[PDB]
């Protein structure tokens, strides 16, 4: 978060549809209350992503299925601090200056992926992430771990 302490850069005025992933109950409620308190066209949506999703709140790097789906569908991935800092500033801050992540255009789109791992929940989840991003799983990018898929996704264009 490298905002200016004098004139912190404002985010665009536009609806923000927040979801959270893998937060504690406590910090999810604090994020909810802060979104509700600032308002300014933002709402917290309840739980794969709700179709109205623009922003995913998560602590740390993308790890959950919801977070990876956000990575590959050009959602903003922001830390809880994005919400609290914006409430402190009095308006929604610029997502990029706050350190938020967004990968546009959708990486994986029209890309083909060979998942060199055995069958199981992890392979199934990665297939769903690939498809959610508009990619196809080969029944040209070889992936042996979710980590490798994430590094591909954040390093395009």
Numbering used by the authors: 474 to 520, 525 to 616, 628 to 645
Source paper text:
KKT4 is a multi-domain kinetochore protein specific to kinetoplastids, such as Trypanosoma brucei.
Our recent X-ray structure of the C-terminal region of KKT4 shows that it has a tandem BRCT (BRCA1 C Terminus) domain fold with a sulfate ion bound in a typical binding site for a phosphorylated serine or threonine. Our initial analysis suggested that the BRCT domain in KKT4 is involved in phosphopeptide binding. The in vivo importance of phosphopeptide binding also demonstrates the potential for rational drug design to target neglected tropical diseases caused by kinetoplastid parasites.
